Amino acid sequence: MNTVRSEKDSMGAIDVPADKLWGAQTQRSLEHFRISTEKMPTSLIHALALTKRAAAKVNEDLGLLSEEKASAIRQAADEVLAGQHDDEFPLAIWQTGSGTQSNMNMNEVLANRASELLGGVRGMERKVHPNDDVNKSQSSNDVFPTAMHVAALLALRKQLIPQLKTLTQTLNEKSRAFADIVKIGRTHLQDATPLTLGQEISGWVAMLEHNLKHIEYSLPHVAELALGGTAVGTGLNTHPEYARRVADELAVITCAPFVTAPNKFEALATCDALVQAHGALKGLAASLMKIANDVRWLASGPRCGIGEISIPENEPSSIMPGKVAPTQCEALTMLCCQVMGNDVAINMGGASGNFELNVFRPMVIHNFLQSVRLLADGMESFNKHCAVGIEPNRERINQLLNESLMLVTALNTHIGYDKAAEIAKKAHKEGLTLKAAALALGYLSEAEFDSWVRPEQMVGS
Amino acid sequence: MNTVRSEKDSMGAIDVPADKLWGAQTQRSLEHFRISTEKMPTSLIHALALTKRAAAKVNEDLGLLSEEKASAIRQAADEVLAGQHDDEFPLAIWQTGSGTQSNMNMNEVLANRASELLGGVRGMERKVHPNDDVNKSQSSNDVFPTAMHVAALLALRKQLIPQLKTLTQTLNEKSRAFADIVKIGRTHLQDATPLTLGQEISGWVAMLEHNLKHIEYSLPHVAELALGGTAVGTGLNTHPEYARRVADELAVITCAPFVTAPNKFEALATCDALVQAHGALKGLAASLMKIANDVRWLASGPRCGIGEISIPENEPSSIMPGKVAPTQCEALTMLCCQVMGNDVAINMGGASGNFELNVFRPMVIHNFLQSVRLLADGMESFNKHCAVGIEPNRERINQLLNESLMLVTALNTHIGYDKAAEIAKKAHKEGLTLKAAALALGYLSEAEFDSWVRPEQMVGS
């Protein structure tokens, strides 16, 4: 659409596309921050809409906003939440550090749309006003941090934690299914004392269970909302009940335990809750990296690696059977590296507040919500396209066990340490199995070896 | 478009949207890696198209590909380069770690489109074939690293370096314009020996000049291309002249000094050139962070900060004059934090190669090209919306100078160290200017103070 509409702010008039719902301040940000391609994610836009919806409801309860306007703002916000206005939010992450410009983007879009819903028009003849109505009782300084925490807490509760629980359940099923399959241990990459495949997988399960607890511990701080601190944390120019009322309303409409931040100065001056919560996410990334690496190394082959397990083959040469890459493991290890880098960017932004306001906020939330998407969707993908189909290669597992030198300790009680060690040394030096070396020395019979060397007795319970 | 077309690969048939040009392998990747929202950037898609265009030209020179097909592939690639097919590349960053799936995305789109250009159709009756024709003489293992370096070198040469030079020129102009404006120094955040505003800005200029050299030093390694190493680096199944010929052709069509990598094993097994080049970019981020912080602190006010300079005010309360935030400085400091995090993700991916292939490649190039966009566009934005308009506040600069205790050293040659120190101590203890303290003690006249205390004599040349 080439045709324009003239929108105004305190700086003057500026042309906006006639087919868009934003206003003058959005247009100025769009034109002045042509930096790369990263924009606010949908989760954050939705959290801003939820914040405005709750603010309008409380302003109406307090007699500060008319019922007609409050209902129109709620309806407009619900359209945003329903996915009807994604193209109305064009602003970059790399904008003002308070996120003021995205606050104004929501104020302008909701005001112009609410005006239409009341039978009016968009633009300067609108019946609902971005600052006086949609931003009533609020500051950018308290709205943007509120939307950050709303988006973060809902993403953790609704996407990440459920996918973590699902992957954990799958691996727990596999651990139980493979509880009796003895395999060679590996420490330092070297052959080691045996354990069952179920025991090894139980370590992955325990890692994921511990990670869930650490993530859960980070949620109460993210649930604290800045809204009501206004410009600098004092709440000047707001009703004394606004802060608690809006947190309560957000809790009602999201079914999440939002509360007003007990100290609004900490809430405005820092991103500390997200620095801490992201600490738990980088812990999960380190655990997932290890699990993903174990899976791809154990599946490596078809003939010149380890090959103890098989995994689903999801992408396609017919001349090369068994030559499909562990692509889910690769995607997962890549995104785990991304989370580690994202943690550094978050830490730098979080360490860089000054006085009453941290102004590194768009960058912090860009990284935080990205890590949540990566970890949630990555666990979902790895689970459905790899973990549910892990299977042992029982003959290969047994071949490696039986060709190893590690089972020699089963001989000690029968023939003594000295002869057992002589057998292991001969097998290693001459390239023999333990059985072949033991028979060559005449220290036992084949029936004795088969009776005495029992891997299923070497793994505890 | 709901209607589908059945596309085939060695795994079988899969439905693709009838209005799209990709094929079976793209569709499988699209469906199996539903991870977050990050896709290949346009610069990388273009670099893949350039690589296929050059490969087709050389295959034709060598008699391996018909003129009719080579010209059709070139035409299709030129359509990609002209921006006609951006929606034909739907794949995620978080895919197979070799980038094979994006290689196949380009093979399939170019084959289906080249078929149409020859009077044929898209799909399984096509006249041009993704693997046999578009991927002739190539492997994913050597194509994706080639596209990574093509995209990286062109982005550095065409976007980042020109914007760096432009910002450097602007600050050099400002340094010359303000060469005679003496201001208070600040070390440890404390008042310090004076220097000129031009001298202070000359430090910013020298930083940017040094950064340009460091970036230039990283370009020769990025210019080395893997293409011709094929699956593992040996060049098996390729003409002995292919590697040099394709690097030469890429050099011709891009006007950049691409060369074939002297060691294809290093070229496939690592991302070392990009790890090193990104080291120079994180150096630039640290320099830009410092410059941006100096600008916003020096402009801080209007009345309770430093206020030595003014900057353009680009976004809008009429009740609050002088209360506009340094928003370009905020966007720039935020993206500098991002580059630091991106460096960690790149380092982890680059450290994580195994044997013949590094399979962290989509993640590495995602971060690398993002840092280039951020630094290039950030310098462009900061220059045009802030740096070109920096101005001194001469009265405020002089007020701070004259109210400081630092000019007292100008008295030493006239009245001696002991009396000068007595004056400074009295001024500090009693809250006086140096002049008022000196007159109160009777150690000089006002005319003597004005004649002797000359800041323009205290900054060298």
Add this chain to the structure above:
Amino acid sequence: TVRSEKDSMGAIDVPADKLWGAQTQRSLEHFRISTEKMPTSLIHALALTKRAAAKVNEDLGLLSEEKASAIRQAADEVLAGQHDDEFPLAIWQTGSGTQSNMNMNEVLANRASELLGGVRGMERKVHPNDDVNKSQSSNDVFPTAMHVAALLALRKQLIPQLKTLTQTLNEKSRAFADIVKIGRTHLQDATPLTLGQEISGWVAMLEHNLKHIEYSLPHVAELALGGTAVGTGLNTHPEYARRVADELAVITCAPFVTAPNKFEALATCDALVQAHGALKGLAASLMKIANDVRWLASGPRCGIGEISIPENEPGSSIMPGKVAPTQCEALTMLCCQVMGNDVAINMGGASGNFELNVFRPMVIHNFLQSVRLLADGMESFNKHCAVGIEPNRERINQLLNESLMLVTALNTHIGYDKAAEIAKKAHKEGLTLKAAALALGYLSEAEFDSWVRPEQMVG
């Protein structure tokens, strides 16, 4: 001047005046990398682990009373600082910490032998592997020592110093609760708040950090000891794991428990990756607090200057008030260090393979360094800076009353447009708000003094 000690590789000369043995001596010849060694906290945690292992082995009838008691006595000597020069090995050693495990086994065996009337060296009465390492593997001993050192350092150094600094700042916040000052957002002048309110933000940050650190302690309290080589506990008494964790809890008075999954305990450093996440959070908070302090104290004349801080370093007599905020500088530097240490830890923690993580010396080197830096940094910042923060009341009032920010107090009495006109005139002509208001004739001096009350603008 030397004696000959032996292991399975043969004989090797060891300094006669040292208590280590053949394996420690070999490590000194093969891992000559940089200067970083095991810190005292880790050496002590290793000695505690061996003391507890010896006690449990005695309880189970696996180790004689005379040997177990002599091992415990030698371990107590290490804990008492008598053997600091007996642990010469680099951080940059075998990734399981085997070499440092053997260093402790050899030193304790040679010393225990002397306590039993014997000698050090190959004629010793107590043996590094058969006695001091009985029921153990390096694979489970080293992560046990890591967690013992980490939990005790958090409980005994970091958490007390965090509480002490928090209490100081809470006292300052109360003392300054009624001092109104200009706010600053985006570095620009902003709506007022009290100095006490601003400091209460620092206090709330430190209180939140304490909770996050406390949440990390239960996982660190889980011990690998008893998992043996790969986690199955093969060749170990079924009660060993619980008994040794119980004994460590007794002797340290800390709530150590045996890890419920020994495979997670051996294959990862996850508890420390998570606990260090809380420490880098504290580093980000301390960076912000330290920066606020040095910026608010900046001057003496050309910065902000709203607070004064103690001056701990000399300066030239001709430069009064120039002294640098050096406690803030040391603190901001160590906060950067913690951020880098977190990356090193994350890479090590992400890099386990199969049954064992072999990045352990590096992980614990970084973790214990971060604890020392944060604990000692908070102690130093508290004692030498925070306890002495004071307001510069005249400067605070000068900045507040000469700013443009108090103009909002006029909106309810005169027009918002009149108030805006006052602010624009003051800014344009370099006037105070009061002077611009009197020049426009919009109010009396009595009206301005009655209407513009900063103390009514901080709620």
Add this chain to the structure above:
Amino acid sequence: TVRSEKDSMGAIDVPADKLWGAQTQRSLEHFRISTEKMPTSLIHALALTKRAAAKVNEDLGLLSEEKASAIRQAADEVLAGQHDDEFPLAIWQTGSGTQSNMNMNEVLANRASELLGGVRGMERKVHPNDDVNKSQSSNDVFPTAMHVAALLALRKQLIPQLKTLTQTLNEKSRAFADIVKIGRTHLQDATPLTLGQEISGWVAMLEHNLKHIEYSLPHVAELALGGTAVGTGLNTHPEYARRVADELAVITCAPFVTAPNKFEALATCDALVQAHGALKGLAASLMKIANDVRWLASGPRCGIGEISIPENEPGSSIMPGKVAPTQCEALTMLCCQVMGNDVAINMGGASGNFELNVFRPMVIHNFLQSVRLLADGMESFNKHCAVGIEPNRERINQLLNESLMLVTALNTHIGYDKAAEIAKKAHKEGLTLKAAALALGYLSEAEFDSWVRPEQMVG
């Protein structure tokens, strides 16, 4: 047992048997943070800086010959290792390095006084500020010492060890140029290459890293000395900056030059941020090389096992061949450390304000540690692992000939579909390619031996 030394803050007791003075003693009371101190390389670089400054001051007629010579003699004693215990200050000090500058000024003044027949303490004949610090500021001395230490460590330790390891691996690549082995991509079996070709990739990585490190040296060679307090050189002789850089170049034999812009030199650590970028590149390359070595050596029976490496540690006699790849573990651990150190350096380097960066002790602590780790790590990996890499020729051949990858050699003789059918049958039925081909009757044993030549598949 003590003497009383004085500064502008008053008198303070200093140990009689030490050579520092009042300001160093105060730092010891105010910066009791952790255990990290200035490394020897930095102490030596500080002594060299003072030696050069004294020589130039003498040349310019600003310092007497007897004092300048005594200062140079005392500095030479520091360089000769006679005063290591005279530098007790923490890294975590004033961010400009002022305290360590004063530590050197006091030690050199007190010792120079003794060399002139005087005493240490307040009756000294040579003075820390007026003599040893003449023409200097802490602001320009500390970054000069940082760059002197960094450039000399890169030239004398890191670059020689990098060249030595590269030469070893180049010899191995030539020795193994004809040993065909299976390729591995995505961890999966892949097209063959020679062991020599695979090692040539490691060699090319190290050669590229050397070039990147060399490109960082010119900026590190630029020295701040002569910029004085804020970069203007106020109160300093106009020739001082060039003369002191020249003298440092003479005495160190390294190409030091004066920084062309002293404001960049004082306000940033940019040269070290950039140089450390090349070091983290080397860390990423060494991580990959070390991982290839330990994976290729993995076994003795249940891994890859294509190469053998020296066994430097003992093991139990019942566990032959189990020894861990411990050099690879130390090297991968220190590579993680370098990555973390880079983050700490980047944060410090990004955090300058106005005329001075005050994150300097932390930046140089990390930078010099990374140099020690990489230099010593490359020395250790070379001597104790790389020189002893050998192929396991039978295992290499077993993996290669039992894989499915050589089937492509049949495409030109029989059908591609026949070759594909052979591979599918071998994979399905657990056969070799040759056995599956003979079972299908698609060729003779002579034809397979003639056609399937791995040595013709590596070009």
